[PDB]
Amino acid sequence: SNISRQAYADMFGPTVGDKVRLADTELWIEVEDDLTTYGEEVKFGGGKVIRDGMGQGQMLAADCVDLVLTNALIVDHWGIVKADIGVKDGRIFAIGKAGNPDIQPNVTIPIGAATEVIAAEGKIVTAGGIDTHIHWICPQQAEEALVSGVTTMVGGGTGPAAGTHATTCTPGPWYISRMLQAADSLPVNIGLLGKGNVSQPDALREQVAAGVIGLKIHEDWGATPAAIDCALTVADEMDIQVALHSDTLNESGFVEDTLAAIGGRTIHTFHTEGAGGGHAPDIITACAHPNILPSSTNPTLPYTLNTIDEHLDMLMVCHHLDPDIAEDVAFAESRIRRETIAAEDVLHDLGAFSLTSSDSQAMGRVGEVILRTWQVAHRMKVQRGALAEETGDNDNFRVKRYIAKYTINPALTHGIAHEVGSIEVGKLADLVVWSPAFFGVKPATVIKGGMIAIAPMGDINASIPTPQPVHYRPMFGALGSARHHCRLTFLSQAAAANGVAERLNLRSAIAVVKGCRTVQKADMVHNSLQPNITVDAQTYEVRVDGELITSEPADVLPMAQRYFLF
Amino acid sequence: SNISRQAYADMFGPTVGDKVRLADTELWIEVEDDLTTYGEEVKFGGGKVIRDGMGQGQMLAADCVDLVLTNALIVDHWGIVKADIGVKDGRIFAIGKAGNPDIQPNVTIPIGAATEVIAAEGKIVTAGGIDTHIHWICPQQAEEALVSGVTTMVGGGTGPAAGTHATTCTPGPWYISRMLQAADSLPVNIGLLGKGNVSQPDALREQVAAGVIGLKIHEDWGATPAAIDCALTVADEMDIQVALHSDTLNESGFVEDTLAAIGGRTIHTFHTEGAGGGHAPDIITACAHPNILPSSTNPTLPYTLNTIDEHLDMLMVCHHLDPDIAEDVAFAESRIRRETIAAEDVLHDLGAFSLTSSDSQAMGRVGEVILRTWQVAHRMKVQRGALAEETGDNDNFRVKRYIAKYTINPALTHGIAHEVGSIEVGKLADLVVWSPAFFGVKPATVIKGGMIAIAPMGDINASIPTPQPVHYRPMFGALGSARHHCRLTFLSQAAAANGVAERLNLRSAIAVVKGCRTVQKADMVHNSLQPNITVDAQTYEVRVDGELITSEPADVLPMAQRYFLF
Amino acid sequence: SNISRQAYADMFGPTVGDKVRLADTELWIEVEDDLTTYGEEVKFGGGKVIRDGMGQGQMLAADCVDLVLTNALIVDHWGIVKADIGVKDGRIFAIGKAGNPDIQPNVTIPIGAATEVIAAEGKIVTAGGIDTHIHWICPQQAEEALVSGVTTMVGGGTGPAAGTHATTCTPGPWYISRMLQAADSLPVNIGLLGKGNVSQPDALREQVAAGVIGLKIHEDWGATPAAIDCALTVADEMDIQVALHSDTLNESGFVEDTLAAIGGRTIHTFHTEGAGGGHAPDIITACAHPNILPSSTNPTLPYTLNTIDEHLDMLMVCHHLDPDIAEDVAFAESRIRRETIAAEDVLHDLGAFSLTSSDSQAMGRVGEVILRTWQVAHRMKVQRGALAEETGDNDNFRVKRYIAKYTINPALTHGIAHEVGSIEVGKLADLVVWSPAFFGVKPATVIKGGMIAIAPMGDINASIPTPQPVHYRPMFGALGSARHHCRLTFLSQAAAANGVAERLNLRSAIAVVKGCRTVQKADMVHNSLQPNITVDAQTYEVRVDGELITSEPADVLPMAQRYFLF
Amino acid sequence: MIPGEYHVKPGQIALNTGRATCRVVVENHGDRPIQVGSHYHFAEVNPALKFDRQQAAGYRLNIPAGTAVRFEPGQKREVELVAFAGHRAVFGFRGEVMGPL
Amino acid sequence: MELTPREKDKLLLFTAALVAERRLARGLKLNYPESVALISAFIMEGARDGKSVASLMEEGRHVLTREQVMEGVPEMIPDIQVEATFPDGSKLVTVHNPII
Amino acid sequence: MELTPREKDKLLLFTAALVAERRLARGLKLNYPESVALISAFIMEGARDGKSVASLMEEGRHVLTREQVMEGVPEMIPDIQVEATFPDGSKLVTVHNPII
Numbered sequence A, B, C: 001s002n003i004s005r006q007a008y009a010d011m012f013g014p015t016v017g018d019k020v021r022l023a024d025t026e027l028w029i030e031v032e033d034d035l036t037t038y039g040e041e042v043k044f045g046g047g048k049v050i051r052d053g054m055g056q057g058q059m060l061a062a063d064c065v066d067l068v069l070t071n072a073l074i075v076d077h078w079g080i081v082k083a084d085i086g087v088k089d090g091r092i093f094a095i096g097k098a099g100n101p102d103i104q105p106n107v108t109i110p111i112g113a114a115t116e117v118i119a120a121e122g123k124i125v126t127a128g129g130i131d132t133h134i135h136w137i138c139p140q141q142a143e144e145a146l147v148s149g150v151t152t153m154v155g156g157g158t159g160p161a162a163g164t165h166a167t168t169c170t171p172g173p174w175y176i177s178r179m180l181q182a183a184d185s186l187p188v189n190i191g192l193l194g195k196g197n198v199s200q201p202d203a204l205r206e207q208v209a210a211g212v213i214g215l216k217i218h219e220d221w222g223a224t225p226a227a228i229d230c231a232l233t234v235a236d237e238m239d240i241q242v243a244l245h246s247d248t249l250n251e252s253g254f255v256e257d258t259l260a261a262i263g264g265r266t267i268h269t270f271h272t273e274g275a276g277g278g279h280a281p282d283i284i285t286a287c288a289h290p291n292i293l294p295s296s297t298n299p300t301l302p303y304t305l306n307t308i309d310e311h312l313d314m315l316m317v318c319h320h321l322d323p324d325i326a327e328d329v330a331f332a333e334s335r336i337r338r339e340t341i342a343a344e345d346v347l348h349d350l351g352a353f354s355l356t357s358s359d360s361q362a363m364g365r366v367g368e369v370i371l372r373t374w375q376v377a378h379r380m381k382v383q384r385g386a387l388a389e390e391t392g393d394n395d396n397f398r399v400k401r402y403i404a405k406y407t408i409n410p411a412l413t414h415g416i417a418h419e420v421g422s423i424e425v426g427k428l429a430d431l432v433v434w435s436p437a438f439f440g441v442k443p444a445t446v447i448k449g450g451m452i453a454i455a456p457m458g459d460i461n462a463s464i465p466t467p468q469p470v471h472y473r474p475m476f477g478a479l480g481s482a483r484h485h486c487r488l489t490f491l492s493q494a495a496a497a498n499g500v501a502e503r504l505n506l507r508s509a510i511a512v513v514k515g516c517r518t519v520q521k522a523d524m525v526h527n528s529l530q531p532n533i534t535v536d537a538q539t540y541e542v543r544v545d546g547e548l549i550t551s552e553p554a555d556v557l558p559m560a561q562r563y564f565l566f
Numbered sequence D: 001m002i003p004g005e006y007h008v009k010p011g012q013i014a015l016n017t018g019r020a021t022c023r024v025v026v027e028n029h030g031d032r033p034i035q036v037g038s039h040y041h042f043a044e045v046n047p048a049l050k051f052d053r054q055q056a057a058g059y060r061l062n063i064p065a066g067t068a069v070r071f072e073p074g075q076k077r078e079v080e081l082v083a084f085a086g087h088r089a090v091f092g093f094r095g096e097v098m099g100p101l
Numbered sequence E, F: 001m002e003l004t005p006r007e008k009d010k011l012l013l014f015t016a017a018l019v020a021e022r023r024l025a026r027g028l029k030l031n032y033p034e035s036v037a038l039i040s041a042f043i044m045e046g047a048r049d050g051k052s053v054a055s056l057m058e059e060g061r062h063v064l065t066r067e068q069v070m071e072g073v074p075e076m077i078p079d080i081q082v083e084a085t086f087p088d089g090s091k092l093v094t095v096h097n098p099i100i
């Protein structure tokens, strides 16, 4: 028998050819494929499919998944597909068709007595976000990021100290050890960055051996050619990443001098547009290089009518400039430039900038990495129309290009894509379930390592979980020993070999970073463009092959006043 | 010398023959006995009795109690008695007369240097409540239940997932292990229920061996005769309880068919009236059976003028029915019935229903088990007058009958009455101290395993603990390692033998369930009635020996608007 | 080249000869010395001094500090000095000049790659406060005290039980063990007091062996000569302190009888003025004795126009007196006396009272020890003018005399001055950073064992840490295993020798008390006066060598309505 | 309707029934007030209270448990005492007994 | 007051509704959380007044109209649910399609 | 604002008193927590104004009468206590038998 497509979509979520608007943006996704067998969909409830001898089989726990997300509309770098997702032992087991092989055809995700169900019909499911520019200013940032759909946080710091307010550096073995111990308490996967600014390689090797998965070179600790060279030499020996905030002041040289010091070695450039820091006015030219993995921080994303006014003043307050000193004013005006801020949005749309990040509480908003990524995608569709790679009457390729910026590309840059960053078999089950009306803004469920870690929750004493007030509350995946089982602390290979986890009595599951040195711009999923980019020293105009790269500032954005109380 | 009875009651609390109103209800308790020697009462304070060489003796810690609750008015299934309660090593040591044997007569509770004092004069002391229908939707339910006077929570779930929103099932070894680990973080004793719906007994034995103390059979996973038979066969082998939410749809048979599948074996029937689920319209007939331990969930307790309107709509929202589909409307009307909802209150008063529970955030209110139990007792006294068992001008027997519904009867049903459920020597010291004006609504102190776990607490910076705002705050009994020492995680005999506590590194004290299979209706304290009950298929009228069982809906209830801000 | 002193002070904080007002009081401190080399100050930031090869050297972690507080204005009992403070392995490493010995002169605090920076220019840095009269009524008192600048809490209790509401006693091995376990969860250093009131020494030795660092003798447990003698005999054997709340009722004798029972042995007298408890009306005479270490609790500090009215009623409510009973009224009037309350402020100014404390939630305010100490210093400067010890046009000696009351003197009294109580090399790095406008009221940063434990923190999602709302939030130094590394649990020598830390699985760093018996009034830093003091039995007038000791009540105080929302 | 109200059975309660009692005249010769609790060993009270200490040996005040008797300076009272029970062993107070009696 | 966690949670809802009430009074079109808070608090006050569940299920539909809320808000709110203490204890009120 | 935990705790009390103030304005008889919050917040505002502890111990008794509260509420409240920052620092105000 037949069912209308509208009735099917209402009951099981959209299928092949149906389109869905992302939140209140102008972005539309189209279902590319559906892994189900029509008539054999699994639904849970009274008189439904997932019941003994029906959609639930007789298999032992070793022979069925621990969790099934039914009828999910998956949005990931690799496709926009309708499927069931199976989770087993806290990892993604399969993407396909769930059910009971005793009575159903084509089952790839067996459901048994040992299986829990998450109903994902009518929901969008994505991988957990990965933020690689975290300043560990306060531990409250973890819940704030998790609520926004970010499940992994890479950064540095020791709390609200001057060093951390300015830089993502956890300095020295003692603080690295204390922060790894504190990380067990937070419901996000964590990796730490050490202080990379030194010209004695042994002071860097000690930090890597203590546990850091990368080193941050920051101009506030001296981003000189000798310090950059030393950190990169150590990174090449120890398989860790180097993150760079370059010499804004051009004190030791210009951008070409920093690029010469790098000498073609792999490096992650933070806030590559330069408002967040870097050689003025031309750090943006780093995105032309094959060895550079460029990220943007979020306050400049997208360009709006309030951007320049907020930034000029935000910078003036951070650095204690005062608008009366001509040279402090000349400095502020050299860092905040409408020309590079507007070009940055286009460079993301073209795939020349590969990652998005926060720069949390240090010229960046920890809960807005995802929201701002989508605001840029919306603004670029409005201004530029369809991408050259786009097939069909949809925005699927633009969506895949942008989701890669906060998922797989940060994971590849930091050598953790073997554990996190995408919905792929064998990876940790860090998943975010979204209602389409709230996509990118307010998730329905956040899953860490196979357990729900945070979710909106209504009145605890109510007869059902939906009555008001509904607000985000930590779940069992965020409690004590269950949290430890469901999160990862990332360590360097040297720290894992030296028995740091045992010495510090770290309780969480441990993962070890690998592949930080071999990753290049060409490896950035959908974001491998190496443009021939220039910045005019006098006008700050950004050009690619002589063509002006610019955009217009937004007056109003989606994913904003419709959703937030303040 | 003599003191007036009014002056005595003001100084030491009521004595034999004095009566106390329970909160703002029409229920009055009468002190049946007093274990003191008049003139030798122990009181703590400046110039009072509990002082060195006076009411406090010279004994070593091994020879005195760790804690004494002085002058308590005990309300338990066994009596309404005035006594001192001694606690030693986190367990009830004695109920009697506290003091110093060096100078006082008849001392059974020795007080020494090692003794802490809780002043219970003018207070009612009860055992901690036991809620056996918990859906582990969120961890915030633990503090909500503890504040209400519930110290043990039995249920199932994995967080806010579809499976748990509908059923009290923790499916499979992986989730059972994670939830046992998460339980260490909560200040309530916990036991878990597994998913009982399977026809392969080995898939059930694996869950019991992982740690579950019972199995839940729920219609949403298929409450068929074969699944019920399989779960009961395993329960009989492994000394665990089976909880049942029967086939509302009558898909596999009618209530008689489920009773045939049960085959006289012990089973706990959840929401036996049927609004919360079960064979429509006659699951209530299960209370006639000797092997059935019947419970009610709380939204239907007591019957009120807003009950039917809230429920018809509460069910319509849960199941996504829509009032326009005649068959969805026919389903809703088959489950929500004024006739069974009204009969349920009378069946509790007669002792035909033996337990009360919540069904937390799944058609039940986690913080209202106790409050609603007393609201039913009040409404039944108003409508029915004195019980046949009542002796004296008081409500003592009705009070003992109802308190047993949330204390000893759930403990006996789940095989944990050797540890919790009553104020009896050797049991865990889970005690609730109530001011009579707030009895059943807002406790004065909640004690877990001998430590105060939660209590109302005023301004932290105030000169005394009473200034506003006064609100419930967790105490030392709810902190880290002290909490672990003061709570129990219940395990099956198979899980304890297999070393599950050591494997999972569970930190809390462990208790093992026993006696789930031998418990019968005749064992339900004050609630052993097996009526000859029938339900008319056309009218839904409930009759006992041909006599109509009904009640009238309340317009206003006690324990409501006088106490709560919202 | 030269810089003006005003421009220098704006850039690096005040230097020698500059004065700073303490909050909104009339107290002014003068910088006595500066350990820097002018032109070589270390400042952190963009283009600043602490950068690779500049102020930051090439040394390995073993050869540089973990943390530097730059340009701090230190205020401690020993001086008011401008210096950099180095912290290494959670302890104070040096007070001096920070930098890089490769390029800078006179460096005593080497900065390397392993060094974190706290910018203290323009801030006052003090040791963490030590409160020795804590009633452990609720665990929320720890965060409240920490926010106020108190890093160590000594006291007793088991939660909101009658015994603890009245006395600082943790009775018996079972409760001592549970409270030591609960202490691991709190971000303050903790030491416990046992119940000292017994005439059998073995019941006291068992409590010391269980872990208590002192014994409290309280009149509510019988402060008789025999109990005091027994506790002091045990204290002399076991190197622990005895705290005393004497017999207000004069039941066993008058103040001379308690002093005879003490027999010249060391004892800490709580609330020595007597409003908080003690022989009426003359317990204040104990401050004449060389073996007595006298403290005040804070509600009587300083004497104000609302003091007597609040206290007469505060006492009437605690003891349930009722203003209609002439003897209860005669008792209240014997304890609350304008004559001793007014004399107490002068006795603090003269150094006859040596410590300040709270008496938390039992006639004392846990978050106001520091604030009230400074309010007394202000009121005494206003009324009395300069102290005889004062040199210069400043209040430096008065400031050193008062800061010693909540830092070093409580530490010496309780045998923990080898670990905490002052900014001195080898001591735990418990430091408080204050903005001068908020000195003594609202700290900028609270550091526990080298990690920031609590600090004001603005919007978590903001682009910087300063936007509103700004409120105190726990930091990494207060999280799980990092907190355990950064706090101390103090134990007696007997408990440490008996392996109590291992038996209870205590996770925090352990320190052992020593020197409780040898400390005398002469050892109280700047507060060693032994006046020839008398109290008239009829008028309550306090005289020193026949001279009336009195003060006038304040109408308005500093550190009050300008700062607090309520 | 008063929530949690008591309906006390009217009457009287006889305290310390069947126990030996005695009466002693006590005067406070001190210049500060003295208050004695119900269970204190009366023979070991503040020495400023003048009375027959031999008669008071092994007795406490015969008053409701937890209450006290106050003696202002120069105040004279005749008090009623009741003998200690149990093992009749006195430890503590002014350390005058420290054993049986 | 001996406030339980559930009572403190409702204070948050009351505060969010105060924000919405002031914005609606300035003539602003309300967004998603403002609209949910405003209607939910209205129901809680109706329960405190002793209105019936049935009466409030209808009254809740006349608090906000489509013209008083931002575009798409009515579609974002298919129903509003809140529990409150009625004279006969806690009850659940569900307001279906509250904004038209 | 650098709000301490004690200041944040008093914000909860202020909010509970706003709920009570609006209910009393609708002519409802107040219940136990509403009555405690209303009188306590009144005292805190009196302290902020610079009234004396003695003056507020008397003024606190004239905020609510027996006719403005539910049956049994006056007996449930034998006293109300609250601390506030007076011009001379934090002080405790106890209002005895506030509702008659």
Ligand code: NI
Pocket: A245, A270, A271, A276, A277
């Ligand atoms: Ni940067």
Ligand code: NI
Pocket: A133, A135, A166, A167, A168, A359, A360, A362
């Ligand atoms: Ni940054």
Ligand code: NI
Pocket: B245, B270, B271, B276, B277
């Ligand atoms: Ni059910």
Ligand code: NI
Pocket: B133, B135, B166, B167, B168, B359, B360, B362
């Ligand atoms: Ni249920």
Ligand code: NI
Pocket: C245, C270, C271, C276, C277
């Ligand atoms: Ni005291």
Ligand code: NI
Pocket: C133, C135, C166, C167, C168, C359, C360, C362
């Ligand atoms: Ni005290």
